[PDB]
Subunit: 337 residues, 4 copies
């Protein structure tokens, strides 16, 4: 009947009420989002006189434990002196409130999915895509610091936040699904649209899976639409193969879930486009004025520009994670010069 | 639309299909129960030719990691040579199936709540209650092994399983909420009816919380009704106070949440239906001098029982009776 | 031949050179101490403009991992804002230098064994002992903060430091042997003289083992001499029994190591085994007489001295006896020790 | 003064007495060896009627804690039901005895350094080297098993044991310095002669540092002498550079410790800082004696030591001594090498 003396629903979520003041300090304004972990609220800090985002974890042991891993990773990152850490949304403090762990973050404006919707799903400019890609490669380089070696594991537009609607600064958020290179047992990871082929295949995975997600995200930021909009894992792999063809034989040979998708030929599941015929050259509109032709003529949307972007994306979407382009090298690509 | 290639529902629980066969080995029979962790199914192991219970953990990282702790706690117990470990439901093995961690257990008949439902919540005899108590005390001694130091954290009739409807053998099940002794991390623990005063007061705690729970369970097994049926935390502490009086001053002086329930005076009293403190005497609840709960062992037997419960319901976790000493209690001789 | 490019000796200790400067910051002065962990040096911090003690961990994987536990415990403590934190030697920072983990502590003056030595092992006054007692009880109260639940595990005079040669402030140092309350990992813990009976008996233990050690240390600080100076574990437990009697049968009935020290007789009672070595009968070496409660204190040297009346000694005796309770479940806890009349 | 009731010396080592019987089961025979961890003894198991080797960990917390990692890693191995875990010295069981953690291993006969001494530091044949290299590659493949991902971190002749003078079997021993692949914790790792360049340069590293050690060891096994006998880290890097040349610039551009050994010129190129042979001029071709009858010319005309055979060996070693840990040969591919055909 009642849960947590009435403060929780039956999903161990705190019943969010606008206007409440948690710890007589944080005035709850509205809900930012919901997740399996719990909720995120926009709140005004009446002590520091600033807006914050507060992540209120479900009042359940499994979700508290997960959130404690996130806190530890965030606090581990914060001991690093590099300016590269500023591409990670900063955890200000945390506290227990009515049996919920609450994480207080610096508040950003909205996420890149909001941004895509604000473009009516037709993309942002290649120039803004470049600024994004350079920041994200820099964030991924930070995560790759050996003492960290952190895999985000859930990169997607929802988990990249824009600081200020009038600027291009972005940051990565939500390390609740993350792990360090030494803590990997879970093989069903990443959001499906952004799921790397080594994961779909059941292979060893490392930080390179985030680079695969980055490549998918960057294409979607410029076209406005998900690159690989799989409805399931077979559909996901088929939509990958439409663009990138049949994976290398040496990979599929060592792939435990190869025959889930392939016979090396593709197995049959309306009909999908043949392998490689959905060329990225055409998706990007390299010689045809960008996505939908809408970028014809705009500065920094030349053939030379688009070819450089296609090359970087293709290096990010390498089938093999041992030769997938790595953050240090990605930052030196001509696309950024 | 779909989840886990259609194998999962929207909460990422495996969609249980009665009669399905896993890996030409486990034939799913029926659902045993649901929960936050996921689901428990009755299944036949065609290879071993035995019935098993399979706990199918939800296909989500948070519950996978929790269930890993539970697996580790169970595999720690397996290593111990003592016969005491057999009062714990045995984990036979675990495997990944369609992205769900599956824990395979030995199969038991039903839980103590079902038993209480069977008796129309009139409780079982003191002799059956005596038998359950010694088994439970032995299970708690095993958890108290210093190298384990495991706190079950959710002892209750539903988590106590009956082997055979024709037998008194029982076992503790479900260590998904369990932890080993350590620095305090979680404060909102135990099921409310069975939650210890140290937890409610926000105080340090240890394996003694499980002994508190056991005392509530044992009285409930014999009366048929929960000892402290709180609708909320304040209702819970007040129903404890009805029976055991105001907590000792030295406890509330340290209790961080003392003033959620009590108020300190210039000279400790309750804050505001309830019976005055201590007037709901366990002497009357057990029917010690009046036959038993309602009207039907000896009065010496009931006095020995009452003494044992009162030691289990010691407000002080430092002096609450420990498993080794409870087994030496005259109630069992 | 050469170790760590010459910077280490064959023990992979850093070869300390007086007057070296590290990282254009720390001016190495002299060696403070040495242990199996490595070394402790006195150094001047040019940035904070203050003296520090730098613990230089051996350049060896096993000792590095050990010290990382110690770093974690200290940093876990540093997150607590209570004043009681003052009574732990403070970790200022840590760094890697020439493959050595270095822990930078506030510099204190000397340890309580030095102080004992400086009394020619005749003790300090009951007034100074009282001050030490109250501070150490506060330290233990801090360690018992539930989020911490830290057992020091090697409380002894050498691990209590005097802050300033002309003040009475003391602090607990060296958490390299420490652990948080949890499942039992270690059984051979605590220095022998200060080792609690539950450890000697191979029993479960918790934070109460540090209180036992404090009981022994406070007596020694006042008398000058260790209360239980065991040459080996059997001698240690016999000397304990001299003062406090046979441990209760319900403890011995559970102790895995009871038969190292005691015999269960045909009448069910426990008695000492003969030593394969002459002890007073159990409990006839009374702490009342060790302290000299009615005869002028230890060796009669406190007769007539302010603060050393029979009433003062009786309160001190009482607190110590609660600290030396055989049962860790009823041994006095730091909160209640601090309410004792000895401090009123 | 007395340590551990007289059972220990002042280094917290158990005082081993030949003959002692532990727990009416293990009869101690003699000291096999000793290291910073403690000691190894040969012992006879009466209850099981078999001879065993017991690693007696020092009675000190830091060594106890290190050895619990070792138990954990070994017990992880043991759970893998395969034939390849045989190339690891098998942990039979463990127990605490008089305050010492004790690891009970199957017992082997001697280590690779003893064999080298028995050759008079002239090396074993290319045929025996081939067999050892195949087993060692199979051990590294097992370690590379994804759920294990175990870096041994201290591959050296003393940690490779011969199973018996008449049986060609060798096994890897001592996982007390080992770790699973993960975030970087230690940087000063591996014995100096066998220490990989990525370690020397302070870079990220993974299981490939063991492959580097194996390449160094395999050469030493055939010649009898260490390939890179650095007296210190600079001497080490400079002897590596003697045989292999200056590392690639893209490594050095990212190496935190590059300027300990190399100077970056105004044209952006890397040279050695301020002795030695010029880089790349100490040819492995000439150390192996590909054309002159092998080491010392002693193998001239011997079966299995043709020009072709030595070229297959040079090539494989050179693949194991790839400066770049991403392109260094890996146990799977090392095992398909023609040198084993
Ligand atoms: C007004 O601010 C925001 C608005 C929005 N919304 C999303 C919905 N649309 C419809 C409106 C715009 C989205 C994010 C923000 N702000 C922001 N700043 C810091 C942290 C987080 C945060 C979000 N998530 C899922 C997290 C998970 N873990 C940790 C932290 C976070 N969010
Ligand atoms: C037919 O068998 C049973 C029937 C029942 N029911 C309960 C409902 N009433 C209405 C009918 C009778 C309940 C349990 C069993 N058997 C049994 N045996 C081993 C393990 C588990 C088990 C249950 N749970 C929640 C777990 C959680 N974690 C691990 C293991 C378990 N259960
Ligand atoms: C001049 O300063 C001192 C002198 C002395 N000596 C002891 C010998 N007698 C003969 C002279 C006086 C003893 C301690 C100090 N100072 C001090 N201050 C902070 C930390 C530590 C420290 C010591 N140890 C073993 C540690 C282990 N872990 C961590 C920290 C420490 N020491
Ligand atoms: C008589 O047997 C041996 C003799 C020798 N010696 C080495 C000196 N030369 C001069 C003589 C021959 C060397 C090894 C063995 N046997 C053997 N068998 C099992 C385990 C181990 C073992 C060695 N180490 C360092 C370990 C570290 N961790 C775990 C286990 C081990 N060793």
């Amino acid at each position: 009947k009642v849960y947590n003396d009435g403060y929780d629903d039956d999903n161990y979520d705190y019943i969010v009420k606008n206007g409440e003041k948690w710890m007589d300090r944080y005035e709850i304004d509205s809900l930012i989002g919901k997740g399996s972990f719990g909720q995120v609220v926009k709140a005004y800090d009446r002590v520091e006189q600033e807006w914050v985002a507060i992540k209120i974890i479900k009042n359940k042991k499994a979700f508290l434990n997960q959130a404690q891993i996130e806190v530890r990773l965030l606090e581990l990152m914060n001991k690093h002196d590099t300016e590269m850490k500023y591409y990670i949304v900063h955890l200000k403090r945390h506290f227990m409130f009515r049996n919920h762990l609450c994480l207080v973050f610096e508040m950003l404006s909205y996420n890149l999915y909001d941004l895509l919707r604000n473009t009516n799903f037709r993309g942002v400019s290649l120039n803004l895509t470049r600024k994004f890609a350079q920041q994200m490669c820099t964030a991924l380089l930070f995560l790759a610091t050996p003492e960290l070696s952190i895999i985000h594991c859930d990169l997607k537009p929802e988990n990249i936040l824009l600081c200020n609607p009038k600027r291009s600064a972005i940051k990565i958020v939500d390390f609740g699904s993350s792990c360090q290179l030494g803590q990997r047992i879970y093989q069903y990871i990443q959001s499906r649209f952004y799921r790397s082929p080594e994961v779909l295949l059941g292979m060893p995975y490392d930080l390179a899976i985030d680079m695969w997600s980055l490549g998918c995200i960057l294409v979607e930021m410029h076209t406005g639409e998900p690159l690989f909009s799989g409805a399931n894992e077979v559909d996901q792999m088929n939509k990958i193969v439409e663009v990138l063809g049949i994976p290398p034989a040496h990979i599929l040979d060592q792939a435990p879930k190869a025959r889930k998708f392939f016979e090396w030929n593709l197995k049959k599941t309306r009909e999908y486009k043949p392998p490689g015929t959905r060329k990225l050259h055409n998706i990007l509109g390299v010689e045809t004025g960008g996505p939908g032709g809408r970028r014809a003529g705009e500065s920094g949307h030349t053939v030379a520009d688009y070819l450089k972007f296609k090359d970087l994306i293709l290096r990010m979407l390498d089938y093999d994670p041992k030769t997938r382009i790595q953050p240090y090298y990605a930052l030196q690509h001509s696309f950024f010069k």
